[PDB]
């Protein structure tokens, strides 16, 4: 398996739907043989380039150790509600587990 940060911007107004979306996404990724290292979301976060016409985002991170055979098939889970774009999996650049 390989390490992936899997961090997506999310529309800033979805900040209280995020806990249910990340439940729905994590409920597919453990059967896909992924191990969770760090699972985070911020809110009140900003951009310098607009996405969905906004300079504002929530940010959601699902940093995992996962099979390389399912990392584009991951899109089938993002299309399972189709409310989020660009998973940005980011293969092996940095890693933190829980907080360390």
């Amino acid at each position: 398996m390989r390490h992936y940060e899997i961090v997506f911007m999310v529309h800033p107004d979805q900040s209280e739907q995020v806990p249910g979306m990340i439940e729905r996404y994590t409920a597919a990724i453990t059967g896909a043989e992924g191990k969770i290292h760090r699972l985070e979301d911020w809110g009140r976060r900003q951009l310098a380039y607009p996405i969905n016409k906004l300079h504002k985002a929530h940010y959601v991170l699902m940093n995992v150790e996962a099979p390389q055979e399912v990392i584009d098939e991951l899109e089938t889970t993002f299309r399972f509600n189709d409310a989020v774009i660009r998973s940005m999996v980011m293969r092996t650049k940095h890693a933190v587990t829980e907080a360390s």
Binding site: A48, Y49, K93, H94
Partner: protein, 55 residues
């Protein structure tokens, strides 16, 4: 180094107009200047910096 997407660092290597500063005004070796340019270009694809300050 230590998670490259640090916009406070990347803003120290660009002009007021957002242009990449030439290696001679930072004393930077070309080995690092090309990787710093890659980091600044990637930061546009992270939405942390505009592609031009004009937009």
């Amino acid at each position: 180094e230590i998670d490259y997407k640090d916009i406070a660092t990347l803003k120290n290597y660009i002009t007021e107009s957002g242009k990449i500063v030439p290696s001679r005004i930072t004393g930077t070796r070309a080995k690092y200047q090309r990787q710093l340019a890659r980091a600044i270009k990637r930061a546009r694809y992270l939405s942390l910096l505009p592609y031009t300050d004009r937009h």
